[PDB]
Amino acid sequence: MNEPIILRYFPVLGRAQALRHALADAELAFRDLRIPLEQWSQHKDSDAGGPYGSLPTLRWHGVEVAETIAIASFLARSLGHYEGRDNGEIARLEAVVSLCYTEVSLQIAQLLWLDLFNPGVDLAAAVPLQFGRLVARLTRLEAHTPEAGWFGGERPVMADYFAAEAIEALRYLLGREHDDALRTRLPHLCALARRMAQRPALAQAWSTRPQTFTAHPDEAAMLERLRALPLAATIG
Amino acid sequence: EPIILRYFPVLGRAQALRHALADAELAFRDLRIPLEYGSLPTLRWHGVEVAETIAIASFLARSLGHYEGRDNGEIARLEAVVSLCYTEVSLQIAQLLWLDLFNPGVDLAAAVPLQFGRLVARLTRLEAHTPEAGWFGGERPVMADYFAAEAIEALRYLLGREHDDALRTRLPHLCALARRMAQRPALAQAWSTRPQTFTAHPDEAAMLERLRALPLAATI
């Protein structure tokens, strides 16, 4: 299993799934190292945890990299995603990653952890707000999402991998009942996520896709509480 | 003005970007939009519209020559500092101020020490890789420096002056870095027009009072 590329994260989707996709889709051999949370207090102050004792981390041919956003940009540079692009075009692609990570992936995770991080919170009041913000942000991304192909043009770049996982994150939270509503509000992002799921070089990644979004002890419990709430009316 | 930064008249997501523009040899309009992807901050730079705080930081890093002569691993160390400082510290400080408006019904006495605790631990990890002299950029400041210094000011803003002594004790090199940044001559005008509130909260003053009444210095 001894790879010169190593991506380290927990056995969950949260902050790293897009990064897994970028590496698999470039047909790089890499070790998808999934560190269990029970074993993580051992890795915090070791090399796997990196300078800041947090995940994800990447090792790329001897070079250690930390933090999801920095890794994304490092990979974009390393895979040629910015070749022939001026700073303005690059910044547009980095805005997409940044928006998907900050406003969607971290927020979906916060919604799942909301009880344990905000004791006594009224889910029925708090969720519609935070969720409504989250959909509003994706709604604006959708307005600049191309009808065909990728943010990267004829080929996918980091923005594409993050945008597709932002849709899967949202779909995971809502459940399959509400696919029709998503397709109505986010048609171009939905279609892009579908295209990404069909890429042959991602077949193994889909095959080994992690089941949960965070390491929440009972995430299934939290979801059914979240899905009891009227989130569909927020979309429409 | 060919360069315009648009944000609210508050610190939150933009002060570090104001500092990067001011510290460079550059005229820019600091456009401050009354508190009343359709989101801010935005930057216009010689005809180019840029959005999202992190992407603006990286755009300026490229434009201002911050990454010249650095390999990709080096660039990514700097970019991770910006990302830690903004997403794990500055954004979370904002979250604490908005906490009971966004999480109606929350018990602050249990919630805050935990979230404030995580936030401090992150900065303490960075403290260990902060230089004793100079900047993350070496001889001159880069974006990492501006964000790191605003992360400290954010924390200080939240605690209050009483607990300054304990901060230096926990985070000497970041405290020194932030101090050094404040005395850069090129930033004097920025400090002169420095906004007085961190967020666009309806009544932040009142919210601060509530937060400081909790046992916050215990977290250090």
Ligand SMILES: N[C@@H](CCC(=O)N[C@@H](CS)C(=O)NCC(=O)O)C(=O)O
């Ligand atoms: N056509 C399907 C759902 C289509 C759909 O909504 N697909 C999007 C969600 S916006 C998606 O999940 N894409 C990933 C995939 O289907 O592979 C149905 O009849 O319910």
Ligand SMILES: N[C@@H](CCC(=O)N[C@@H](CS)C(=O)NCC(=O)O)C(=O)O
């Ligand atoms: N040491 C001074 C206080 C200055 C101070 O607060 N220094 C650090 C504490 S972390 C700081 O935040 N400096 C940033 C600044 O000068 O704006 C005093 O007590 O008279």
